[PDB]
Amino acid sequence: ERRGRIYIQAHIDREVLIVVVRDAKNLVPMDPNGLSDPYVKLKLIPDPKSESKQKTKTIKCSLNPEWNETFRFQLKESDKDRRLSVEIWDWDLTSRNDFMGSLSFGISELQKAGVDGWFKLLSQEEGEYFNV
Amino acid sequence: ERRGRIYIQAHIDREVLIVVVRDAKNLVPMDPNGLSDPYVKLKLIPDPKSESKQKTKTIKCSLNPEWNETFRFQLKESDKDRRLSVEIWDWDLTSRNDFMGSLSFGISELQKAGVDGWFKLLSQEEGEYFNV
Ligand SMILES: N[C@H](CO)COP(=O)(O)O
Ligand SMILES: [Ca+2]
Ligand SMILES: [Ca+2]
Ligand SMILES: [Ca+2]
Ligand SMILES: [Ca+2]
Ligand SMILES: [Ca+2]
Ligand SMILES: [Ca+2]
């Protein structure tokens, strides 16, 4: 568990993905002060023009952010071949935000069973394929 | 020690920085296969146009690379206000290489005493300032 963990809750209502991003523990420091400014980015991938994107607020200087935010996604046919992508990023003022941890759930699999618990954060490339 | 450690040897011999990049342990996975393709990038910073850049070879699929490569840098007056920047990157074929760990030593401080040992890898922004 090199990048910490995040507590996610996600299930499908009808054709509506409901995602709850509660909190995260032991995130990796990304700033010179030894901390980071975490915010989570949710997308349905593959997504070209990044048309699905939704973000939580940014928590400043914390390696254990608590967001408690809910998000709704209106699904479609095509989405059955997509994955719910959850990525944590470190907000920076004077530079590209830095990647911190990733995770993803197959939409086809969420329709069969929702999720509610802690997940180990993976690397960005790795997180677009699995969840642990 | 979230990103593992690297064994560095560096000292100055009459205006010449000699850096030995031996090996690294417990690097963080950066690829879908659960590994990474580490290579170290050495620069003297600030160095906007990267005229300083020098790289080790890339070791494929390893979180414990052994490089054993020596590098020489011809110092100057100005370099007394610069730092030796050591960054490990994960080589990727189909995408921007991913950052793995960073570290830096003040050139002014190396002139007073060289280093030879293990160093904890820091985040990129953090690594441009310290060396734990
Ligand atoms: N530029 C960063 C990329 O991850 C953050 O961007 P964004 O706020 O659009 O998610
Ligand atoms: Ca940062
Ligand atoms: Ca930041
Ligand atoms: Ca940044
Ligand atoms: Ca990679
Ligand atoms: Ca790679
Ligand atoms: Ca990449």
Coordinates of C-alpha atoms and ligand atoms in Angstrom, one line a residue:
Chain A
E1 CA 0.0 0.0 0.0
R2 CA 2.6 2.5 -1.2
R3 CA 0.2 5.3 -1.9
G4 CA -2.3 5.0 0.9
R5 CA -5.9 4.2 0.7
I6 CA -9.2 5.8 -0.2
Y7 CA -12.8 5.0 1.0
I8 CA -15.2 4.8 -1.9
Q9 CA -18.9 3.9 -2.1
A10 CA -20.3 3.3 -5.6
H11 CA -23.4 1.6 -6.9
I12 CA -25.8 1.9 -9.8
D13 CA -29.4 3.1 -9.2
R14 CA -31.1 2.5 -12.6
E15 CA -28.9 4.1 -15.3
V16 CA -27.4 6.3 -12.7
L17 CA -23.9 5.9 -11.1
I18 CA -23.8 7.2 -7.6
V19 CA -20.3 7.7 -6.2
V20 CA -19.5 8.8 -2.7
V21 CA -15.9 9.9 -2.0
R22 CA -15.5 9.9 1.8
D23 CA -11.8 10.2 2.8
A24 CA -8.2 9.0 2.2
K25 CA -5.4 7.8 4.5
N26 CA -1.6 7.9 4.3
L27 CA -1.3 9.8 1.1
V28 CA 2.2 10.4 -0.2
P29 CA 3.8 13.9 0.4
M30 CA 3.9 15.9 -2.9
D31 CA 5.0 19.3 -1.8
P32 CA 8.1 20.8 -0.3
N33 CA 6.3 21.2 3.0
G34 CA 6.0 17.4 3.3
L35 CA 2.3 17.4 2.6
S36 CA -0.1 17.8 -0.4
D37 CA -3.4 19.4 -1.4
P38 CA -5.6 16.4 -2.4
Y39 CA -8.7 16.5 -4.5
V40 CA -10.3 13.6 -6.3
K41 CA -11.1 13.5 -10.0
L42 CA -13.9 11.2 -11.3
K43 CA -14.3 10.3 -15.0
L44 CA -15.8 7.5 -17.0
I45 CA -13.1 6.1 -19.3
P46 CA -12.2 5.9 -22.1
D47 CA -13.1 9.6 -22.5
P48 CA -11.4 11.6 -25.2
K49 CA -12.2 15.3 -24.7
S50 CA -12.4 14.6 -20.9
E51 CA -16.2 15.2 -21.1
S52 CA -17.1 13.1 -18.0
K53 CA -14.9 14.9 -15.4
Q54 CA -16.1 15.7 -11.9
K55 CA -14.0 16.9 -9.0
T56 CA -14.2 17.1 -5.2
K57 CA -13.1 20.2 -3.5
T58 CA -9.3 20.5 -2.7
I59 CA -8.2 20.0 0.9
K60 CA -5.1 22.0 1.6
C61 CA -2.0 20.5 3.2
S62 CA -3.3 17.1 4.2
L63 CA -2.2 13.5 3.8
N64 CA -5.5 12.3 5.3
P65 CA -8.2 14.3 3.5
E66 CA -11.9 14.0 4.3
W67 CA -14.1 15.1 1.4
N68 CA -17.5 13.4 1.9
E69 CA -18.9 14.4 -1.4
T70 CA -21.5 12.6 -3.6
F71 CA -21.5 12.5 -7.4
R72 CA -24.1 11.3 -9.9
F73 CA -23.3 10.1 -13.4
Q74 CA -26.1 9.5 -16.0
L75 CA -25.1 6.2 -17.7
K76 CA -25.8 5.0 -21.3
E77 CA -25.3 1.9 -23.5
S78 CA -21.7 2.7 -24.4
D79 CA -20.7 3.1 -20.7
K80 CA -21.1 -0.7 -20.4
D81 CA -17.6 -0.9 -22.0
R82 CA -16.2 1.9 -19.7
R83 CA -14.7 2.1 -16.3
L84 CA -15.3 4.5 -13.4
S85 CA -11.9 6.2 -13.0
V86 CA -11.0 7.6 -9.6
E87 CA -7.8 9.7 -9.4
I88 CA -6.3 11.7 -6.5
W89 CA -4.3 14.7 -7.5
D90 CA -2.2 17.2 -5.6
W91 CA -3.2 20.7 -6.5
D92 CA -0.2 23.1 -7.1
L93 CA -0.4 26.8 -7.7
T94 CA 2.7 27.3 -9.8
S95 CA 2.8 24.0 -11.7
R96 CA 1.0 21.0 -13.2
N97 CA -0.9 19.3 -10.4
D98 CA 0.9 16.1 -9.4
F99 CA -0.7 12.6 -9.6
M100 CA -1.0 10.8 -6.2
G101 CA -3.1 7.6 -6.6
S102 CA -5.6 6.0 -8.9
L103 CA -8.2 3.4 -9.0
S104 CA -11.0 2.2 -11.3
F105 CA -14.1 0.0 -11.4
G106 CA -15.7 -1.6 -14.4
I107 CA -19.1 -0.1 -15.0
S108 CA -20.3 -3.5 -16.1
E109 CA -19.2 -5.0 -12.8
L110 CA -20.8 -2.2 -10.7
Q111 CA -24.2 -3.1 -12.3
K112 CA -23.8 -6.5 -10.8
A113 CA -22.6 -5.3 -7.4
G114 CA -21.8 -2.0 -5.8
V115 CA -18.7 -1.3 -3.7
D116 CA -18.3 0.2 -0.2
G117 CA -15.0 0.1 1.5
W118 CA -11.3 0.9 1.5
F119 CA -9.2 0.6 -1.7
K120 CA -5.4 0.7 -2.1
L121 CA -4.4 3.5 -4.4
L122 CA -2.5 2.4 -7.6
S123 CA -0.2 4.2 -10.1
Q124 CA -2.0 6.1 -12.8
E125 CA -1.4 3.6 -15.6
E126 CA -2.1 0.7 -13.3
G127 CA -5.2 2.4 -11.8
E128 CA -7.0 2.6 -15.1
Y129 CA -7.2 -1.2 -15.1
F130 CA -7.7 -2.4 -11.6
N131 CA -8.7 -1.8 -8.0
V132 CA -7.6 -3.7 -4.9
Chain B
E1 CA 10.5 6.0 3.0
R2 CA 7.5 6.0 0.7
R3 CA 9.4 5.8 -2.6
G4 CA 12.3 3.6 -1.7
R5 CA 16.0 4.5 -1.5
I6 CA 19.0 5.1 -3.8
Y7 CA 22.7 4.6 -3.2
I8 CA 24.6 7.7 -4.3
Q9 CA 28.3 8.5 -4.1
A10 CA 29.3 12.1 -4.9
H11 CA 32.3 14.3 -4.3
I12 CA 34.2 17.2 -5.9
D13 CA 37.8 16.9 -7.2
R14 CA 39.2 20.3 -8.2
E15 CA 36.2 21.7 -10.1
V16 CA 34.9 18.3 -11.2
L17 CA 31.8 16.7 -9.8
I18 CA 32.1 13.0 -9.8
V19 CA 28.8 11.1 -9.2
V20 CA 28.4 7.4 -8.9
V21 CA 24.8 6.0 -9.2
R22 CA 25.0 2.5 -7.7
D23 CA 21.5 1.0 -7.2
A24 CA 18.0 1.6 -5.7
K25 CA 15.7 -0.4 -3.5
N26 CA 11.9 -0.7 -3.1
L27 CA 10.9 1.6 -5.9
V28 CA 7.2 2.2 -6.3
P29 CA 5.4 0.3 -9.1
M30 CA 4.6 2.6 -12.1
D31 CA 3.4 0.2 -14.8
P32 CA 0.4 -2.1 -15.2
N33 CA 2.6 -5.1 -14.7
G34 CA 3.3 -3.9 -11.1
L35 CA 6.9 -2.9 -11.9
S36 CA 8.7 0.0 -13.6
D37 CA 11.7 0.7 -16.0
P38 CA 14.0 2.9 -13.8
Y39 CA 16.7 5.2 -15.1
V40 CA 18.3 8.1 -13.3
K41 CA 18.5 11.6 -14.6
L42 CA 21.3 13.9 -13.3
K43 CA 21.3 17.7 -13.8
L44 CA 22.7 20.8 -12.1
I45 CA 19.8 23.0 -11.2
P46 CA 18.6 25.6 -11.9
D47 CA 19.2 24.6 -15.5
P48 CA 16.2 25.7 -17.7
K49 CA 17.6 24.5 -21.0
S50 CA 18.8 21.1 -19.6
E51 CA 22.4 21.5 -21.0
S52 CA 23.5 19.7 -17.8
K53 CA 21.4 16.5 -18.2
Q54 CA 23.0 13.1 -18.0
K55 CA 21.2 9.7 -17.8
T56 CA 22.0 6.2 -16.7
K57 CA 20.8 3.3 -18.8
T58 CA 17.2 2.1 -18.3
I59 CA 16.7 -1.2 -16.4
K60 CA 13.6 -2.8 -17.6
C61 CA 10.9 -4.2 -15.2
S62 CA 12.6 -3.7 -11.9
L63 CA 11.9 -2.1 -8.5
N64 CA 15.4 -2.7 -7.4
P65 CA 17.7 -1.5 -10.2
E66 CA 21.4 -1.8 -10.2
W67 CA 23.1 0.7 -12.5
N68 CA 26.7 1.2 -11.3
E69 CA 27.5 4.2 -13.6
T70 CA 29.8 7.1 -13.0
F71 CA 29.3 10.6 -14.2
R72 CA 31.5 13.7 -14.4
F73 CA 30.4 17.3 -14.3
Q74 CA 32.7 20.2 -15.1
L75 CA 31.9 22.8 -12.5
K76 CA 32.1 26.6 -12.6
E77 CA 31.7 29.8 -10.5
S78 CA 27.9 29.9 -11.0
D79 CA 27.4 26.3 -10.0
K80 CA 28.2 27.4 -6.4
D81 CA 24.6 28.6 -6.3
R82 CA 23.2 25.3 -7.8
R83 CA 22.3 21.9 -6.6
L84 CA 23.0 18.4 -8.0
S85 CA 19.6 17.1 -8.9
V86 CA 19.1 13.3 -9.0
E87 CA 15.7 12.0 -10.3
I88 CA 14.6 8.5 -11.0
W89 CA 12.1 8.1 -13.8
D90 CA 10.1 5.2 -15.2
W91 CA 10.6 4.9 -18.9
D92 CA 7.3 4.3 -20.8
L93 CA 7.0 3.6 -24.6
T94 CA 3.6 5.0 -25.2
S95 CA 3.6 7.9 -22.8
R96 CA 5.5 10.6 -20.9
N97 CA 7.9 8.8 -18.6
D98 CA 6.6 8.8 -15.0
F99 CA 8.4 10.4 -12.0
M100 CA 9.5 8.0 -9.3
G101 CA 11.7 9.8 -6.8
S102 CA 14.0 12.7 -6.4
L103 CA 16.9 14.0 -4.4
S104 CA 19.4 16.9 -4.5
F105 CA 22.6 18.0 -3.0
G106 CA 23.9 21.6 -2.7
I107 CA 27.1 22.0 -4.8
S108 CA 28.4 24.4 -2.2
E109 CA 28.0 21.6 0.4
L110 CA 29.5 18.9 -1.7
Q111 CA 32.7 21.0 -1.9
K112 CA 32.9 20.9 1.9
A113 CA 32.1 17.2 2.1
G114 CA 31.2 14.4 -0.3
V115 CA 28.5 11.9 0.2
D116 CA 28.5 8.1 0.1
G117 CA 25.4 6.2 1.3
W118 CA 21.7 5.6 1.1
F119 CA 19.2 8.3 0.5
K120 CA 15.4 8.3 0.9
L121 CA 13.7 9.3 -2.4
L122 CA 11.5 12.4 -2.2
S123 CA 8.7 13.9 -4.3
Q124 CA 9.9 15.9 -7.4
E125 CA 9.2 19.3 -5.9
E126 CA 10.5 18.3 -2.5
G127 CA 13.6 16.6 -4.0
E128 CA 14.8 19.8 -5.6
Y129 CA 15.4 21.2 -2.1
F130 CA 16.5 18.4 0.2
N131 CA 18.2 15.1 0.6
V132 CA 17.1 13.0 3.6
Ligands
LIG1 N1 -3.8 19.8 -14.6 C1 -4.1 18.7 -13.6 C2 -4.2 17.3 -14.4 O1 -4.4 16.3 -13.6 C3 -5.3 18.9 -12.8 O2 -6.3 19.3 -13.8 P1 -7.9 19.3 -13.5 O3 -8.2 20.3 -12.4 O4 -8.5 19.7 -14.8 O5 -8.3 17.9 -13.1
CA2 CA 3.3 19.4 -5.6
CA3 CA 0.4 21.1 -3.7
CA4 CA 3.5 20.3 -9.6
CA5 CA 4.6 3.8 -16.3
CA6 CA 7.3 1.7 -17.9
CA7 CA 3.5 7.3 -18.7

